[PDB]
Structures are given as structure tokens and as C-alpha cells.
Amino acid sequence: TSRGWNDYSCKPSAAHPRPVVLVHGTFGNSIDNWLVLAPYLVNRGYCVFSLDYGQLPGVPFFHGLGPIDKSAEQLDVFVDKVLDATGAPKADLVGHSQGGMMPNYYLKFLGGADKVNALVGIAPDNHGTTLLGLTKLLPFFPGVEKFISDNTPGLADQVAGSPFITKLTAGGDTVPGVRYTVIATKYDQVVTPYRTQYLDGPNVRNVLLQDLCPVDLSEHVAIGTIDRIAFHEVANALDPARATPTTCASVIG
Ligand SMILES: [Cl-]
Ligand SMILES: [Cl-]
Numbered sequence: 001t002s003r004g005w006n007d008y009s010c011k012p013s014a015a016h017p018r019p020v021v022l023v024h025g026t027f028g029n030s031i032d033n034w035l036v037l038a039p040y041l042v043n044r045g046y047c048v049f050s051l052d053y054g055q056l057p058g059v060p061f062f063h064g065l066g067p068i069d070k071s072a073e074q075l076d077v078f079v080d081k082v083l084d085a086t087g088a089p090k091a092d093l094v095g096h097s098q099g100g101m102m103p104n105y106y107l108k109f110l111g112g113a114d115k116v117n118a119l120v121g122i123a124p125d126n127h128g129t130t131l132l133g134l135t136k137l138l139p140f141f142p143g144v145e146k147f148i149s150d151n152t153p154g155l156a157d158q159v160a161g162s163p164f165i166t167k168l169t170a171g172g173d174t175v176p177g178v179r180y181t182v183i184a185t186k187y188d189q190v191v192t193p194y195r196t197q198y199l200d201g202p203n204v205r206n207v208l209l210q211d212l213c214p215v216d217l218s219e220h221v222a223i224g225t226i227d228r229i230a231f232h233e234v235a236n237a238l239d240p241a242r243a244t245p246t247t248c249a250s251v252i253g
Pocket of ligand 1 (some may be wrong): 074
């Protein structure tokens with residue numbers, strides 16, 4: 001068995017020798033964020049895995065709420081067990097929103113550089129956002145609204161100028177030996193200005209979704225959940241030597 005989703009017997013093929021760890025966004029979980037992307041990568045031959053992180057006690061479904069330094073520890077644990085089960089030396093990470101920013105904490109302060117070949121962030125808040133911007137996620141996750149406040153650490157830790165973001169971004173954006181891809185959309189309402197999502201460093205590709213397809217108008221949530229154009233670009237980053245140009249035609253299945 002050499003393709004799968006959360007199949008711990010999966011054995012990365014020679015063509016795709018790194019398992020992929022999928023990292024959800026704020027109010028998300030391991031399943032619902034990835035109902036398109038995971039089978040998309042399964043059918044291209046990847047061993048895919050996705051985790052839950054930042055669970056709040058007695059708050060089911062809506063994760064990414066706990067403190068982000070701890071969420072990075074949960075990521076650390078998960079990646080290790082994916083690598084031990086699979087026998088591979090490194091994983092590739094793909095994350096949406098909080099999920100594309102949070103692994104940077106893991107890379108910088110928890111020894112993640114040694115275990116990660118690539119980090120692909122889809123609309124990552126890499127230099128933070130505002131509470132008001134995170135509020136724009138709420139129409140997509142109604143029913144989470146009663147479990148949160150201005151002080152929910154998962155929310156407050158994402159705010160530019162917070163202790164978390166200050167610490168995350170004191171040094172450089174990048175760490176040696178990791179290939180970074182950032183995919184952003186100019187219709188992003190949650191994390192603005194959108195160029196703050198980009199990473200400055202020598203091994204970074206920063207891609208504007210609209211330069212690949214000017215009429216793909218996906219906003220922050222759609223880009224990480226259903227946007228097949230964005231996912232084609234994810235697939236380019238996971239196997240760069242076999243990449244093909246991502247166009248408007250990549251919506252068609
Ligand atoms: Cl845990
Ligand atoms: Cl418009």
C-alpha cells in the first residue's frame with residue numbers, strides 16, 4: 001500500500017518518498033478542511049496524513065483555538081509518529097491559514113528543520129493578522145461563535161504585535177534547508193494586506209493565485225478548501241521536477 005489518507009501502513013513510493021502532513025486552519029479539523037485536497041493527493045500517489053490541533057475541552061469540530069506554541073508542539077509529536085510509522089526521513093507539510101503559519105514555529109524552535117523537506121502555506125498569516133480579520137471566518141463556522149472570545153489564545157496569538165507573532169518573526173522568515181511555497185489570493189479578507197503572507201528568504205516561491213488564473217476569485221477560506229487551481233500548485237511544490245504550469249484550465253477535473 002503506497003497511497004492513502006491517515007493510513008499508517010502507507011509506504012511512500014520512490015516517485016513520492018515523503019509523506020504529506022496536512023495542517024488545518026482556525027476553526028478547522030483534520031477531515032473537513034481536506035475533503036478535496038487529500039484525495040487529490042492520494043490519486044497522485046502520495047501518502048497523506050492530517051492532524052487535529054489546538055482542541056479546546058468540550059468544543060468539538062472547531063479546532064485551532066488553543067495557544068499556538070502548544071499547537072506547534074502537537075504538530076511536532078504528529079510528524080514524528082508519521083515518520084516512525086512510515087520509515088521516511090522527512091515529511092512535506094501543507095497548511096491553510098493558521099495552519100500554514102504555525103509550522104514555522106515548529107521549524108524555528110522545535111527542531112522541525114531536520115524533519116521537513118517542504119512547507120507549503122495556503123493563505124498563511126505568516127506576519128499575523130487582526131482579530132477583526134479572523135472574525136470574517138465566522139460565517140463559515142457558525143456555532144463556533146459561542147465558544148470563543150477576544151482572548152481565545154488561538155485567535156489572540158495570530159494578532160500582529162502579539163507575543164507569539166513577535167517571537168515567531170524576531171529573526172528571519174526562513175530556516176536553512178526547507179523549501180517554502182506560499183500561495184495567496186488578492187481577494188483575501190481575513191489576512192491583509194495579502195503580501196504579509198509571503199516569506200522573504202532564498203528558498204521561497206511566493207505565488208499569487210490570480211497570476212495563475214486572473215478569474216479565480218477565491219477568498220481566504222475557499223483557497224484552502226475547494227480551489228483546484230491552488231491545489232495544482234500545491235502538487236507542483238510537492239514534486240517540483242515534474243511540475244506543469246498551473247492555469248485556469250486546472251479547475252476542470
Ligand atoms: Cl497531543
Ligand atoms: Cl471584485
